[PDB]
Design an enzyme around this catalytic site. Structure first.
Site, PDB file in Angstrom:
ATOM      1  CE1 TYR A 176     -18.280   5.207  42.567  1.00 39.99           C
ATOM      2  CE2 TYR A 176     -19.932   6.613  41.285  1.00 39.99           C
ATOM      3  CZ  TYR A 176     -18.974   5.568  41.357  1.00 39.99           C
ATOM      4  OH  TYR A 176     -18.496   5.112  40.274  1.00 39.99           O
ATOM      5  CB  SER A 207     -22.177   7.236  38.032  1.00 40.80           C
ATOM      6  OG  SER A 207     -21.672   8.434  37.458  1.00 40.80           O
ATOM      7  CE1 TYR A 208     -22.977   0.685  43.367  1.00 39.66           C
ATOM      8  CE2 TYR A 208     -21.833  -0.346  41.296  1.00 39.66           C
ATOM      9  CZ  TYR A 208     -22.632  -0.621  42.317  1.00 39.66           C
ATOM     10  OH  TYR A 208     -22.770  -1.767  42.937  1.00 39.66           O
ATOM     11  CG  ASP A 264     -23.838   9.226  29.857  1.00 39.74           C
ATOM     12  OD1 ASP A 264     -22.826   8.409  29.699  1.00 39.74           O
ATOM     13  OD2 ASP A 264     -24.221   9.267  31.018  1.00 39.74           O
ATOM     14  CG  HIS A 275     -21.314   9.582  33.122  1.00 40.30           C
ATOM     15  ND1 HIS A 275     -22.670   9.066  33.140  1.00 40.30           N
ATOM     16  CD2 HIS A 275     -20.641   9.435  34.123  1.00 40.30           C
ATOM     17  CE1 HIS A 275     -22.755   8.468  34.360  1.00 40.30           C
ATOM     18  NE2 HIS A 275     -21.430   8.279  34.972  1.00 40.30           N
TER      19      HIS A 275
HETATM   20  N1  LIG Z   1     -16.575   3.235  34.494  1.00 37.55           N
HETATM   21  C1  LIG Z   1     -15.971   3.174  35.678  1.00 37.55           C
HETATM   22  C2  LIG Z   1     -14.613   3.707  35.948  1.00 37.55           C
HETATM   23  C3  LIG Z   1     -14.014   3.536  37.264  1.00 37.55           C
HETATM   24  O1  LIG Z   1     -14.544   3.515  38.425  1.00 37.55           O
HETATM   25  N2  LIG Z   1     -12.708   4.229  37.298  1.00 37.55           N
HETATM   26  C4  LIG Z   1     -12.034   3.521  36.144  1.00 37.55           C
HETATM   27  C5  LIG Z   1     -10.973   2.436  36.188  1.00 37.55           C
HETATM   28  N3  LIG Z   1     -10.058   2.587  37.707  1.00 37.55           N
HETATM   29  C6  LIG Z   1     -10.508   3.175  38.795  1.00 37.55           C
HETATM   30  N4  LIG Z   1      -9.436   3.351  39.501  1.00 37.55           N
HETATM   31  N5  LIG Z   1      -8.640   2.585  39.074  1.00 37.55           N
HETATM   32  C7  LIG Z   1      -8.709   2.335  37.772  1.00 37.55           C
HETATM   33  C8  LIG Z   1      -7.637   1.542  36.882  1.00 37.55           C
HETATM   34  F1  LIG Z   1      -6.917   1.376  37.486  1.00 37.55           F
HETATM   35  F2  LIG Z   1      -8.430   0.321  36.457  1.00 37.55           F
HETATM   36  F3  LIG Z   1      -7.578   2.312  36.022  1.00 37.55           F
HETATM   37  C9  LIG Z   1     -11.900   4.021  38.637  1.00 37.55           C
HETATM   38  C10 LIG Z   1     -16.962   4.306  36.539  1.00 37.55           C
HETATM   39  C11 LIG Z   1     -18.283   4.211  36.360  1.00 37.55           C
HETATM   40  C12 LIG Z   1     -19.111   3.069  37.115  1.00 37.55           C
HETATM   41  C13 LIG Z   1     -20.384   3.125  36.896  1.00 37.55           C
HETATM   42  F4  LIG Z   1     -21.083   2.069  37.422  1.00 37.55           F
HETATM   43  C14 LIG Z   1     -21.100   4.034  36.072  1.00 37.55           C
HETATM   44  F5  LIG Z   1     -22.283   3.744  36.024  1.00 37.55           F
HETATM   45  C15 LIG Z   1     -20.646   5.113  35.380  1.00 37.55           C
HETATM   46  C16 LIG Z   1     -19.222   5.064  35.583  1.00 37.55           C
HETATM   47  F6  LIG Z   1     -18.475   6.005  34.882  1.00 37.55           F
END
Ligand SMILES: N[C@@H](CC(=O)N1CCn2c(nnc2C(F)(F)F)C1)Cc1cc(F)c(F)cc1F
Ligand SMILES: *[C@@H]1O[C@H](CO)[C@@H](O[C@@H]2O[C@H](CO)[C@@H](O)[C@H](O)[C@H]2NC(C)=O)[C@H](O)[C@H]1NC(C)=O
Ligand SMILES: *[C@@H]1O[C@H](CO)[C@@H](O[C@@H]2O[C@H](CO)[C@@H](O)[C@H](O)[C@H]2NC(C)=O)[C@H](O)[C@H]1NC(C)=O
Ligand SMILES: *[C@@H]1O[C@H](CO)[C@@H](O[C@@H]2O[C@H](CO)[C@@H](O)[C@H](O)[C@H]2NC(C)=O)[C@H](O)[C@H]1NC(C)=O
Ligand SMILES: *[C@@H]1O[C@H](CO)[C@@H](O[C@@H]2O[C@H](CO)[C@@H](O)[C@H](O)[C@H]2NC(C)=O)[C@H](O)[C@H]1NC(C)=O
Ligand SMILES: *[C@@H]1O[C@H](CO)[C@@H](O[C@@H]2O[C@H](CO)[C@@H](O)[C@H](O)[C@H]2NC(C)=O)[C@H](O)[C@H]1NC(C)=O
Ligand SMILES: *[C@@H]1O[C@H](CO)[C@@H](O[C@@H]2O[C@H](CO)[C@@H](O)[C@H](O)[C@H]2NC(C)=O)[C@H](O)[C@H]1NC(C)=O
Ligand SMILES: *[C@@H]1O[C@H](CO)[C@@H](O[C@H]2O[C@H](CO)[C@@H](O)[C@H](O)[C@H]2NC(C)=O)[C@H](O)[C@H]1NC(C)=O
Ligand SMILES: *[C@@H]1O[C@H](CO)[C@@H](O[C@H]2O[C@H](CO)[C@@H](O)[C@H](O)[C@H]2NC(C)=O)[C@H](O)[C@H]1NC(C)=O
Ligand SMILES: *[C@H]1O[C@H](CO)[C@@H](O[C@@H]2O[C@H](CO)[C@@H](O)[C@H](O)[C@H]2NC(C)=O)[C@H](O)[C@H]1NC(C)=O
Ligand SMILES: N[C@@H](CC(=O)N1CCn2c(nnc2C(F)(F)F)C1)Cc1cc(F)c(F)cc1F
Ligand SMILES: *[C@@H]1O[C@H](CO)[C@@H](O)[C@H](O)[C@H]1NC(C)=O
Ligand SMILES: *[C@@H]1O[C@H](CO)[C@@H](O)[C@H](O)[C@H]1NC(C)=O
Ligand SMILES: *[C@@H]1O[C@H](CO)[C@@H](O)[C@H](O)[C@H]1NC(C)=O
Ligand SMILES: *[C@@H]1O[C@H](CO)[C@@H](O)[C@H](O)[C@H]1NC(C)=O
Ligand SMILES: *[C@@H]1O[C@H](CO)[C@@H](O)[C@H](O)[C@H]1NC(C)=O
Ligand SMILES: *[C@@H]1O[C@H](CO)[C@@H](O)[C@H](O)[C@H]1NC(C)=O
Ligand code: NA
Lengths: 728, 728
Positions: A509, A592-593, A670, A702
């Site tokens: 990841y 994803s990442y 997606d 996704h």
């Molecule tokens: N869009 C990202 C959202 C994420 O990583 N969480 C959402 C926000 N978050 C998290 N942990 N705490 C929080 C918050 F506190 F900000 F809500 C993790 C996930 C994400 C990263 C990628 F590179 C990708 F290609 C797709 C993808 F879906």
């Protein structure tokens, strides 16, 4: 001979983990659903009584998706006609049932297609959003008061988040916050008027003759972002003759000078609310503390009560500024912040004082604050045994910070190293949830003397079934890279023999502040690959990974697609040198990442990997959303970070794919990582004459989580891996 | 010793086939490009001169895509900035060069983004379409006269066709017709106001942040069709009146009663035009012959000059009603129509008499009428040796129908059996173009005595090269089913040994009135498969195929997806029973209609085929366009043919795909067979748990013909086939 953990076992969930999801309704009782019947338990003694029969709704007519009992226990909200939208959003129909008069309310019912609903924290008031506007019901049977009139699809959102705020800031669809006793209702309003829209095709059922075009306001890196406003309305003074008056609380001047975000809202007292704002360049945030003024009926935020939080090495907070935990009187608060060494710890703040005092410290981090009383603050950290991938509950004496007591570390050290917790209303009791390395274990405890009252669920049934299965083992260890230790884990096949060479699959990841090497017990695809296919599945946490301090986490600041990709190659290189790994059979895969990293790794020309699989990968940062992307990359302008945006794409490395077998997978619907990202990767590969394998999943998003698509993607990936490893 | 024809030879075009494309500019002179130079040749003696030196436009500042000389030889139209659109349509920039004063015209230039341009048949007038409106220039350097003001992007088209008319009716983008001496300009106007739009994403270069949504008015089966109107304007009055009137000629009452199409426009004389209309139910067509009334300036069509053409067994014409060829005086014409026996032959009509006289007959068909003089009518047919897959040029004496001479049959019977012809302005000379079974051969002939003047191109260079390669051989023969013969061809590996068992690949198209078994010489993918991979590649023309009478062609009427699919399966059974085919290794592949047939065959459960490749296949007829689909299937309504429309989908056979290996390929920018068609096939396969291979080609259309994508798809398909046949 005993069977192994097969692909079908994973896909059909043959071996299910039992859970124990309770709902605290006071300081000493909780609700638990058993046999479709809701029971109420007394924490102290463990005795219960039925709260609501499963048959109570036999002729309801609709399939109930979920329920929500009002805080006072007088009513129950019934959710049906569930229709999913994004990761957290959805719409549904609702009905309210009076538990007292045992009657279903038929007057002034919540509308169909309601976007969000919530009881006040106390009593039984309701606030819901419909057609992007906020409504409040003082009584379940009385007509609702319309709070806002500006709601407009894809443009103005009142009380609910737009796409980017849902996904990246709040991780929730709701943008509503009831004051502690329910008097006030604060809410945010998002304006996406100038946000560009992403558009993609949706094919739907075979019967739809013309594909539908889905359009959603989605700001890609550097594009116009939605704007935000914050309001607070008094729900105790609503009138059915006059429109409700919402009082706006404006962001501080240091925020209004440019683009910014609202990132946290936390009520401190019945008349004091705190708000945290973040600049679009996410290394500067401001917390405002505002008090209600009965005289003017306005909310004033004294500058003396402002708290600034900034970062010189990266962004603010793990993903966003942390939430404050206020004391009873609201005059002080505790919050996790990175200390001078770059380790996240708990700081104690005076609301009108600039400097805070750190109450914990060390080369480990506080994961979260879980409960606060006048004598103790309870939190979860990875301090125990210096294992960043372990989690335990601790309490610290607020009068003597040197008095820290671990409350879960020694409960069962061999079976339990990763804890989560749920405290009752006043922290009188807490439920501990161990999720690894052994089978999940749920227990109930009393706070006064931290007594272990009883075992709620020990998964002994699953344990009995797994005894007849050849299960893989998990190794958690670390390697040294430039004086720094980095952790990795390996899922090892049954009867592992160090004198043999096993093919190896690197599961990655690696996004910023992520953790893939931990003590959590999991039954997943890797379990099958190790158990049945005899493949070692490893995961590594390198630079950019979380919970080990900013020195490691901020290493990738303004530089995604560099150190985190190089570190996975370095790990595989190390692993390839181990005696039990076949260096001719090393593969890598991610979603994803992780799909981006896998692709960047495969196009690095390292020569270490034979093949790889990328599922829904990002291919160039300019295609991903602004809030997440800019947080780590800054802006894609020549004066900021455009050069690195252009140097970190998958496409630029297309020719290096000539020496690997690549499988690229992506859902066509997606809404998160647009199909566009994989469409550009395949086009770049076609352009340099590199052959590869691909698979699109029609109308999947996704998660590619529909039942049929889930089974198909893992079936397809398994054939690819086995073929790549020369496995029958 | 002696190399084989490899995949690289095919993809790199190492063995180049030479042709001889000439342009007749008069009755005895033609233009030919040699070394980037344009020469003018004297047909009679073969001597030439430089018409336009290659260094003429070295400083033009642009790469000239094509050129066109005015009928009077005074000017040359230079086309550049060529931007392709659909199959025939494209936009470009144009400049006019004065050949006499050897000067490029810089005033009153044709606008950029011009959709279509055409010289008048005589002199140097020009008519062009820009922004969907027609313009006429009497002189190259003078201002244009606007003819229409209704043009509107995607809505109203004047002088050009919309998507469906371009692809299915006209096979051309232009919808304008100059009268013989250029006095009148006739044109069609299409209205797509209520035509639904197909929408799909276009990703473009990696630099585009948001994908673009392409929207095209495209009527799927049963949907609202574009309406059409016909007009004629007198261009000789343009400089005398402010706004010349476009006189409309309305369709006959028989057509106005319901939806209909304009399917043919042919000028008979300077003041007589013929138009053919076709009802949306394509088995009834009407030809009106209209005369200019010099007293009223109107066009009148006498009902006594109206001709009806209908079909009791199918649709009218092979793909559309045939075009008339008028005698000089315009009082009679020749036209191909099927006789009482079901075979297409030439009929002679008096313009005001309903009964015609057939001038040819037999159990074979006339392919087309090539030229008509006062004494002879020249045509191409497949009469020779009763080979429906062969083509020869014939001449019939108009004063004695029993006098028919074949002009090409015996020229070189072993090397030449598929001819095409090109006559000079007044048919004084003709170029014969032999395209098989041997290497293409181009020759010039004089019509006065039918003597061969000389060989223009014999491809001796290629013949020299091919002698160093082990080329495959081609067999053309037939099998008898139900007392009727059905032809097939086989590409056999070099040194073919009927005692061995070779893997077999059935190459299929099989759409209505198609022909895959012919005498044409080709260097394609099959050449490589037979030559290097020793695979027999076969094709079969069963029910529904053309050029063999209506009994065979109309057999699939209202029943697509039945007999033509069954016949391909039976063809494979008959082939396996020939003794040199390995029954365990029979594959099938097809593109377009062939992809649909391939998918239907793989889903039949026949057990005959091991694997198959479908490229851009139709999957359900309601997704394809109205004109083509309804011609064979009628309307998708319960009162017409909905049941067969629902019974002939690929999706309903999903379960049967569990018995085979399938590769599905589709370009994401296919404006013809929408990606939607393959998206629904893959979804149906995922829903039943069938594994398969897939490949999308970003931004490629129905031809997947970009250089890189072309090479990539055939390379990808070669691996799949080799793997399926165990051909490492
Ligand atoms: N869009 C990202 C959202 C994420 O990583 N969480 C959402 C926000 N978050 C998290 N942990 N705490 C929080 C918050 F506190 F900000 F809500 C993790 C996930 C994400 C990263 C990628 F590179 C990708 F290609 C797709 C993808 F879906
Ligand atoms: C919730 O808290 C609010 C605010 O403290 C309470 O409202 C106040 O009540 C007093 C009377 O005790 C009034 O004089 C104030 O004017 C009220 N303030 C506002 C802003 O309305 C409210 O009573 C509390 N509700 C509950 C259920 O305890
Ligand atoms: C937040 O980050 C930004 C960008 O990294 C810092 O702003 C400037 O950024 C440019 C390049 O984008 C540099 O040339 C400047 O040196 C940076 N600093 C200044 C003062 O201009 C900004 O400093 C960071 N904020 C904090 C509080 O560290
Ligand atoms: C081909 O050659 C012919 C004859 O040499 C040229 O035609 C003309 O022929 C007459 C009588 O033979 C001569 O008086 C003329 O001088 C010839 N024309 C010219 C321009 O010299 C003809 O021009 C040649 N054609 C080409 C295309 O070169
Ligand atoms: C193209 O066809 C459309 C009908 O589909 C015509 O539009 C109508 O025109 C009438 C007369 O002006 C209006 O009253 C209607 O409101 C229009 N309907 C629609 C759907 O627009 C249009 O006039 C035609 N255009 C041409 C140039 O013929
Ligand atoms: C030339 O004549 C045509 C036909 O009369 C004119 O087109 C009309 O224009 C009016 C006013 O703009 C519209 O109301 C009509 O619907 C149009 N009819 C058609 C068939 O287009 C055109 O405007 C005239 N051009 C000039 C310069 O006067
Ligand atoms: C092209 O054909 C048109 C139509 O026949 C000719 O125009 C006619 O010419 C005659 C003179 O012989 C006039 O009496 C008519 O009034 C004209 N009709 C129209 C509609 O204009 C025209 O002369 C021919 N062009 C050439 C170069 O011969
Ligand atoms: C759990 O057990 C206790 C007994 O210790 C129950 O008793 C309390 O509540 C009863 C009714 O709800 C009363 O009749 C008792 O007087 C009262 N006893 C005490 C010591 O408070 C309690 O209700 C039970 N709770 C549940 C959820 O069943
Ligand atoms: C939402 O934000 C938009 C964007 O600023 C506001 O619209 C303003 O700008 C519009 C052009 O984008 C102009 O039409 C107006 O000058 C201005 N106001 C309006 C209503 O368009 C818009 O007001 C905001 N809406 C709300 C409810 O806050
Ligand atoms: C929201 O939609 C539902 C479903 O249409 C409405 O409930 C009824 O649903 C039945 C079918 O189960 C229909 O026959 C009725 O016409 C619907 N209306 C009523 C009044 O019963 C429901 O009314 C809608 N809710 C609101 C608040 O309008
Ligand atoms: N749309 C079809 C066009 C065609 O078959 N020609 C166009 C019309 N035509 C032809 N031959 N003469 C004529 C004309 F005279 F009508 F123009 C053949 C081709 C076609 C058929 C399919 F089933 C499919 F999936 C895709 C596809 F592209
Ligand atoms: C609750 O309802 C379920 C059916 O939904 C039934 O199977 C079960 O027996 C009921 N539980 C009890 C305790 O009666
Ligand atoms: C409330 O505001 C809306 C929109 O501004 C208006 O249409 C409505 O009439 C108002 N109601 C009252 C009671 O003022
Ligand atoms: C230290 O190690 C890192 C990777 O862990 C490497 O990138 C760097 O070059 C090394 N040297 C220094 C001075 O950091
Ligand atoms: C014409 O141009 C070509 C370039 O393609 C050159 O090779 C040739 O020699 C030129 N011939 C003449 C006669 O100018
Ligand atoms: C066509 O466009 C080019 C580039 O914009 C411009 O230089 C030229 O003048 C245009 N030509 C005409 C005829 O308008
Ligand atoms: C034309 O086709 C329709 C549809 O099958 C049919 O009902 C009608 O009779 C046909 N007309 C003729 C003359 O065959
Ligand atoms: Na206990």
């Amino acid at each position: 001979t005993r069977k192994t953990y097969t692909l079908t076992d994973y896909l059909k969930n043959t071996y299910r983990l039992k859970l124990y999801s309770l709902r605290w309704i006071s300081d000493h009782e909780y609700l638990y659903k058993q046999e479709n019947n809701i029971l109420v338990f007394n924490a102290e003694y463990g005795n219960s009584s039925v709260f609501l029969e499963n048959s109570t709704f036999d002729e309801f007519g609709h399939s109930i998706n979920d329920y929500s009992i009002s805080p006072d226990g007088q009513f129950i909200l019934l959710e049906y006609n569930y229709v999913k939208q994004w990761r957290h959003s959805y719409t549904a129909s609702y009905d309210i049932y009076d538990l007292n008069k045992r009657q279903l309310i038929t007057e002034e019912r919540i509308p169909n297609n309601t976007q969000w609903v919530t009881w006040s924290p106390v009593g039984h008031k309701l606030a819901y959003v419909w057609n992007n506007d906020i409504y409040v019901k003082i009584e379940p049977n009385l007509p609702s008061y319309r709070i806002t009139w500006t709601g407009k699809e894809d443009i103005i959102y009142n009380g609910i988040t737009d796409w980017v705020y849902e996904e990246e800031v709040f991780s929730a669809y709701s943008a509503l916050w009831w004051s502690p006793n329910g008097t006030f209702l604060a809410y945010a309003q998002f304006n996406d008027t100038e946000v560009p829209l992403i558009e993609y095709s949706f094919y739907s059922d075979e019967s739809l003759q013309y594909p539908k075009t889905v359009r959603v306001p989605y700001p890609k890196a550097g594009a116009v972002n939605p704007t935000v406003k914050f309001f607070v309305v008094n729900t105790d003074s609503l009138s059915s003759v006059t429109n409700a008056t919402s009082i706006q609380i404006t962001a501080p001047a240091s925020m209004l000078i440019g683009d910014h975000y609202l990132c946290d809202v936390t009520w401190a007292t019945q008349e004091r609310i705190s708000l945290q704002w973040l600049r679009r360049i996410q290394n500067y945030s401001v917390m405002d503390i505002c008090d209600y003024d009965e005289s003017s009926g306005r909310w004033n935020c004294l500058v003396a009560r402002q708290h600034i939080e900034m970062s010189t090495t990266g962004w603010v907070g793990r993903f966003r500024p942390s939430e404050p935990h206020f004391t009873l009187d609201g005059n002080s608060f505790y919050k996790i912040i990175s200390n001078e060494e770059g380790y996240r710890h708990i700081c104690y703040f005076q609301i009108d004082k600039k400097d805070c005092t750190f109450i914990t410290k060390g080369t480990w981090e506080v994961i979260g604050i879980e409960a606060l009383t006048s004598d103790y603050l309870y939190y979860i950290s990875n301090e125990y045994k210096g294992m960043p991938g372990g989690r335990n509950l601790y309490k610290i004496q607020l009068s003597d910070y040197t008095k820290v007591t671990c409350l879960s570390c020694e409960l069962n050290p061999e079976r339990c190293q990763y804890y989560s917790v749920s405290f009752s209303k006043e922290a009188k009791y807490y439920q501990l949830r161990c999720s690894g390395p052994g089978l999940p274990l749920y227990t109930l405890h009393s706070s006064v003397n931290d007594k272990g009252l009883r075992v709620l669920e020990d998964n002994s049934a699953l344990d009995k079934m797994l005894q007849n299965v050849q299960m893989p083992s998990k190794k958690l260890d670390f390697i040294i890279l430039n004086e720094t230790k980095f952790w990795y884990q390996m899922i090892l096949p049954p009867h592992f023999d160090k004198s043999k060479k096993y093919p190896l699959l690197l599961d990655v990841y690696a996004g910023p502040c992520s953790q893939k090497a931990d003590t959590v017990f999991r039954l997943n695809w890797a379990t099958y690959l190790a158990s049945t296919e005899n493949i070692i599945v490893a995961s590594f946490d390198g630079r950019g990974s979380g919970y080990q301090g900013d020195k490691i986490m901020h290493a990738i600041n303004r530089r995604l697609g560099t150190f985190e990709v190089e570190d996975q190659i370095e790990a595989a290189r190390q692993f390839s040198k181990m005696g039990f790994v076949d260096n001719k059979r090393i593969a890598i895969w991610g979603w994803s990442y992780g799909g981006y990293v896998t692709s960047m790794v495969l196009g690095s020309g390292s020569g270490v990997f034979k093949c790889g699989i990328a599922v829904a990968p990002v291919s160039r940062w300019e295609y991903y959303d602004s809030v997440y992307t800019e947080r780590y990359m800054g802006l894609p302008t020549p004066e900021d970070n455009l050069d690195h945006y252009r140097n970190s794409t998958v496409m630029s490395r297309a020719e290096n794919f000539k020496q690997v077998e690549y499988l690229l997978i992506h859902g066509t619907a997606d809404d998160n990582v647009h199909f566009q990202q994989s469409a550009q990767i395949s086009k770049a590969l076609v352009d340099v004459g590199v052959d590869f394998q691909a698979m699109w999943y029609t109308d999947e998003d996704h998660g590619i989580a529909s039942s049929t698509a889930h089974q198909h993607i893992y079936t397809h990936m398994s054939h690819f891996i086995k073929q790549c490893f020369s496995l029958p």
